Structures are given as C-alpha cells and as structure tokens.
Design an enzyme around this catalytic site. Sequence first.
Site, PDB file in Angstrom:
ATOM      1  N   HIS A  43       0.829  -1.198   0.000  1.00 28.56           N
ATOM      2  CA  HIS A  43       0.000   0.000   0.000  1.00 28.56           C
ATOM      3  C   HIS A  43       0.864   1.249   0.000  1.00 28.56           C
ATOM      4  CE1 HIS A  43      -0.467   1.436   4.470  1.00 28.56           C
ATOM      5  NE2 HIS A  43       0.686   0.795   4.348  1.00 28.56           N
ATOM      6  N   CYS A  97       3.563   5.475   5.530  1.00 29.42           N
ATOM      7  CA  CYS A  97       3.717   4.273   6.339  1.00 29.42           C
ATOM      8  C   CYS A  97       5.177   3.830   6.351  1.00 29.42           C
ATOM      9  CB  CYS A  97       2.824   3.162   5.786  1.00 29.42           C
ATOM     10  SG  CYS A  97       2.886   1.578   6.657  1.00 29.42           S
ATOM     11  N   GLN A 115      -7.412  -2.746   9.604  1.00 33.49           N
ATOM     12  CA  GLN A 115      -8.583  -1.894   9.758  1.00 33.49           C
ATOM     13  C   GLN A 115      -9.624  -2.302   8.718  1.00 33.49           C
ATOM     14  OE1 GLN A 115      -5.942   1.962  10.719  1.00 33.49           O
ATOM     15  NE2 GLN A 115      -8.142   2.371  10.662  1.00 33.49           N
ATOM     16  N   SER A 138      -6.085   5.666   9.619  1.00 36.03           N
ATOM     17  CA  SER A 138      -4.705   6.071   9.365  1.00 36.03           C
ATOM     18  C   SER A 138      -4.594   7.170   8.326  1.00 36.03           C
ATOM     19  CB  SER A 138      -3.835   4.895   8.916  1.00 36.03           C
ATOM     20  OG  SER A 138      -4.047   3.727   9.690  1.00 36.03           O
ATOM     21  N   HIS A 141      -5.401   5.361   1.457  1.00 32.85           N
ATOM     22  CA  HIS A 141      -4.525   4.291   0.956  1.00 32.85           C
ATOM     23  C   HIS A 141      -4.782   4.032  -0.523  1.00 32.85           C
ATOM     24  CE1 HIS A 141      -3.881   2.879   5.206  1.00 32.85           C
ATOM     25  NE2 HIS A 141      -5.108   3.358   5.327  1.00 32.85           N
TER      26      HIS A 141
HETATM   27  O1  LIG Z   1       3.498  -0.479   9.212  1.00 34.06           O
HETATM   28  C1  LIG Z   1       3.658  -1.874   9.408  1.00 34.06           C
HETATM   29  C2  LIG Z   1       4.776  -2.429   8.565  1.00 34.06           C
HETATM   30  C3  LIG Z   1       4.586  -3.591   7.826  1.00 34.06           C
HETATM   31  C4  LIG Z   1       5.582  -4.120   7.047  1.00 34.06           C
HETATM   32  C5  LIG Z   1       6.834  -3.483   6.994  1.00 34.06           C
HETATM   33  N1  LIG Z   1       7.950  -3.787   6.335  1.00 34.06           N
HETATM   34  C6  LIG Z   1       8.847  -2.800   6.668  1.00 34.06           C
HETATM   35  C7  LIG Z   1       8.306  -1.895   7.528  1.00 34.06           C
HETATM   36  N2  LIG Z   1       7.013  -2.318   7.743  1.00 34.06           N
HETATM   37  C8  LIG Z   1       6.001  -1.801   8.519  1.00 34.06           C
END
Ligand SMILES: OCc1ccc2nccn2c1
Length: 147
Positions: A43, A97, A115, A138, A141
């Site tokens: 995502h 993220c 979610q 959040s 997305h």
């Molecule tokens: O935000 C949750 C998440 C999931 C996977 C992931 N891979 C590297 C950092 N990451 C963080």
Amino acid sequence: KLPPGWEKAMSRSSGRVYYFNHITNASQWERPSGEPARVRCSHLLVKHSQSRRPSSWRQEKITRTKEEALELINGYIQKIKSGEEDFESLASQFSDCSSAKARGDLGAFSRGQMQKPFEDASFALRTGEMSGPVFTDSGIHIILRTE
Ligand SMILES: OCc1ccc2nccn2c1
Ligand SMILES: OCc1ccc2nccn2c1
Ligand SMILES: OCc1ccc2nccn2c1
C-alpha cells in the site's frame, strides 16, 4: 454477473459505460473478471491532519487536510495508471507508512488483522488489481494485491 462490489456507471464526460467498485473504489472501462484465507498486499498511505497519528517518517507534524491528501492520492493513481511511475517507486518515496522502506509491502494477512475498510478492499481485489482511494483512521490508501 459482476464480481463482489462491482457496478455499472455512466461517464459524465464521454457517455460510455464504465465499471466502479464500491468496496475498493476502483474504476475502469473494462468489464471486470469474475475467498482465500489470506492475501498479500502493498500500500501507499497519505496521512492527513485527522489521522490517528498525524506523524510519519516523512514529516514530524503532518498538517495537510484530508482533501489535500485525497488530491495527492488521485495524482499518484493517475501516474501509476499512465505508466509514468510505478506503484513501488511512489510508495518508497511518498508513503507515510513505515512500510515505504519495503516498497509498500505489508506481507500476508487474514481477516481480523487490518482496519476494516482496508481489509474489505484487500479481499475484494483480485491478484494483481489495485484499489482506488481507501479511507481508514490512518489516512488514505492505495492498495495493490500481490498474492
Ligand atoms: O506499518 C507496518 C509495517 C509492515 C511491514 C513493513 N515492512 C517494513 C516496515 N514495515 C512496517
Ligand atoms: O480487468 C481488466 C482490466 C482492469 C483494469 C484495467 N486498467 C487498464 C486496463 N485494464 C484492464
Ligand atoms: O506488526 C506490524 C509491523 C510493525 C513494524 C514492522 N516492521 C517490519 C514489519 N513490521 C510489522
């Protein structure tokens, strides 16, 4: 006829029929084709000032409005669809993220972990398909189902 969530609609600027999914917010000219315990998705997240935590590795204080975040998401979708940019490149550069560091990959998950709007969109995507803007606490997305 149409797979889960898909409906037929009418282009305002051309008159031609198109297809829209009210679970994933995907839209396309082509008629769609058509559940597993687990899916894998990547995502791209754009946060906004009302995000549950309005901070990210990109910005200590996220101040953009939800409307501004939606404009950014819409622009990324345009570039992905035109082939001007790849999903993975945009996620790495611009996702709020921490999974940005993994080209947006979240790994594999089942129902009951994410979610709910994100979960529902992920499981309504077919392998290889991409969502439209999906809204959660959040932020907004773009979801790519990879497995
Ligand atoms: O935000 C949750 C998440 C999931 C996977 C992931 N891979 C590297 C950092 N990451 C963080
Ligand atoms: O499902 C067939 C399909 C879906 C989406 C799409 N975008 C460009 C070509 N496309 C074909
Ligand atoms: O459990 C969620 C989560 C959080 C952080 C993280 N880093 C790599 C994978 N990750 C997954």
